[PDB]
Amino acid sequence: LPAHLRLQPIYWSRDDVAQWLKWAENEFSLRPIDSNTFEMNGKALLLLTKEDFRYRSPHSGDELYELLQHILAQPAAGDELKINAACRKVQHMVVKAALLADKFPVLHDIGNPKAIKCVPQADVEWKFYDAQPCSDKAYKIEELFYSYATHSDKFTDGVCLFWNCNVDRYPANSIVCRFDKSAFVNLKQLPFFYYSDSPCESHVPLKSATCITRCNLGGAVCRHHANEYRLYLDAYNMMISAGFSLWVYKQFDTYNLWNTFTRL
Ligand SMILES: CC(C)N(CCCNC(=O)Nc1ccc(C(C)(C)C)cc1)C[C@H]1O[C@@H](n2cc(Br)c3c(N)ncnc32)[C@H](O)[C@@H]1O
Ligand SMILES: [Zn+2]
C-alpha cells in the first residue's frame, strides 16, 4: 500500500485516487481501467454512490466501492517511524512560528523527558519539566507533574509547550498537540499553516493563503517553497489522519508571521 493510501481516504489527492485504482487492479486481478476513470480527490470519491461506481467502471466499480467501504471500516496502520518524523516536523514548524510571532522570552517545555529543544536556534530561555525525566537528562529537567489545579498560577511568563503531554487542563499561554474538550477551554484550535524564512529559489504552481513565505506576498510561490509546502502538508496530514490535534493560545495570529517579511 503506497504511503498516501494509508491515510484516511478523505485526505487522498486526485493522484492518490489514481494510484489506488492501480493498486486495486493488481491486488484483485481486475480489468485495467483508465487512470482518469475517477478524476477527483478522495473527498469527492466518498460522495459517489455505488451506482456511480458501477457506471464509471462496469467491470470493476462494485468491487472498488466495496474495497473503499472496507478501507473506511478498517483503517490501515500507519508507520510509527514516519509518524514520529511527521510529528517532529510539525512540532518544529509550529513552535518556531510561535516564537517568531510573539517573541516569548521563556518557553516552559512540560512533558519533555529528554531535554531536547524542538527549535534549538530560537533566541529564548528554554526550560524543561517532566514527571519522569530520563535519568541521563534529569540533571537539567525539573521533576514535576503538571496539574492545572496546582500550577495554574505558575509558568505565566513566556509560553508553555505541551507536546503530547496530556494534562487535566492547559494554561492559556500554551502550545499543544494531543492524541485522541474541557482540557482545551483556555485555548483555540490551531489551523493549518506553513511558514518559512529560508531563501527563495526558482530551479505545478501553488495557490494557497496558508503558504506564509516571502514569495507568497505577491502570490507567486517559488519552486523551492512550493516543494517544501507540499512536503509539510503531507507530514501534517499524516499526523491529523492518525488522530492528533493541535491547539494554541488564543492570541496566536498568522499576520504576525507575515510581518516578519520586510520591504528592503
Ligand atoms: C512526550 C512523551 C515522552 N510522552 C508521550 C505520552 C503520550 N504518547 C502518545 O500519545 N503517543 C502516541 C500516540 C499515538 C500513536 C499512533 C501509533 C496512533 C500514531 C503513537 C504514539 C509523555 C511525556 O510526558 C510526561 N508527562 C505525562 C503527563 Br500526563 C505529565 C504531567 N501531568 N506533568 C508532567 N509530565 C507529564 C511523561 O513522563 C512523558 O515523558
Ligand atoms: Zn519562496
Residue numbers in the entry: 5 to 81, 300 to 402, 433 to 455, 466 to 526
What do the authors of the reporting publication say about this deposited model?
One such enzymatic activity is encoded by the SARS-CoV-2 nsp14 methyltransferase (MTase) domain, which, together with another MTase nsp16, caps the viral mRNAs for stability, efficient translation, and evasion of the host immune response. Specifically, the nsp14 N7-MTase domain methylates the N7 atom of guanosine at the 5’end of mRNA to generate the N7MeGpppA2’OH-RNA structure, which is then methylated at the 2’O atom of the initiating nucleotide by nsp16 to make the N7MeGpppN2’OMe-RNA structure. The N7-MTase domain is located at the C-terminus of nsp14, whereas the N-terminus harbors an exoribonuclease domain (ExoN). That is, to assist crystallization, we fused a pH-sensitive mutant of the polymer-forming sterile alpha motif (SAM) domain of human translocation ETS leukaemia (TEL) protein (TELSAM) (residues 47 to 124) to the MTase core, and then used the fusion protein (TEL-MTase) for co-crystallization with SGC0946 and SGC8158.
The bromo-deazaadenosine moiety of SGC0946 is well-defined in the electron density map and overlays with the adenosine portion of SAM in the nsp14-MTaseSAM structure. In a similar manner to the adenosine of SAM, the bromo-deazaadenine ring is accommodated in a cavity formed by the Ala353, Phe367, Tyr368, Cys387 and Val389 side chains, with its N1 and N6 atoms making hydrogen bonds with the backbone amide and carboxyl groups of Tyr368, respectively, and the ribose sugar making direct hydrogen bonds with the Asp352 side chain, as well as water mediated interactions with both the Gln354 side chain and main chain. The bulky t-butylphenyl portion of SGC0946 is less defined in the electron density map, indicative of flexibility when binding to the SAM site. The best interpretation of the electron density places t-butylphenyl in a small hydrophobic cavity delineated by residues Ile305, Phe401, Ala504 and Phe506 on the nsp14 MTase core surface. Intriguingly, this cavity is the site of RNA binding; for example, in the structure of SARS-CoV nsp14/nsp10 with SAH and GpppA, the guanine of GpppA is accommodated in this cavity. This strongly alludes to SGC0946 as a bi-substrate inhibitor of SARS-CoV-2 nsp14: co-occupying both the SAM and the GpppA cap binding sites and as a novel scaffold for the design of potent antivirals targeting both SAM and RNA binding. Interestingly, the extended urea and isopropyl ammonium between the bromo-deazaadenosine and the t-butylphenyl portions of SGC0946 is largely devoid of direct interactions with the nsp14 MTase core. The most significant interactions are with water molecules, wherein the urea linkage, for example, makes water mediated interaction with Asn306, Asn386, Asn388 and Phe401. Compared to the DOT1LSGC0946 structure, the t-butylphenyl group and the urea-isopropyl linkage in our structure occupy different positions relative to the deazaadenosine.
